[PDB]
Amino acid sequence: FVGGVV
Numbered sequence: 001f002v003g004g005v006v
């Protein structure tokens with residue numbers, strides 16, 4: 001699972 005970037 002690759003986290004998103006805000």
Ligand SMILES: OC(C(F)(F)F)C(F)(F)F
Nearest residue numbers: 001002003004005006
């Ligand atoms: O989501 C993938 C998984 F499932 F963990 F292998 C990734 F390698 F990209 F992290």
Ligand SMILES: OC(C(F)(F)F)C(F)(F)F
Nearest residue numbers: 001002003004005006
């Ligand atoms: O999962 C959220 C997302 F979607 F990437 F914005 C978090 F901000 F936490 F990364």
Ligand SMILES: OC(C(F)(F)F)C(F)(F)F
Nearest residue numbers: 001002003004005006
């Ligand atoms: O935008 C993605 C979603 F859709 F929520 F899965 C993330 F995982 F990055 F948050």
Ligand SMILES: OC(C(F)(F)F)C(F)(F)F
Nearest residue numbers: 001002003004005006
């Ligand atoms: O990355 C932010 C988000 F999360 F999409 F709202 C930005 F506002 F910068 F687009």
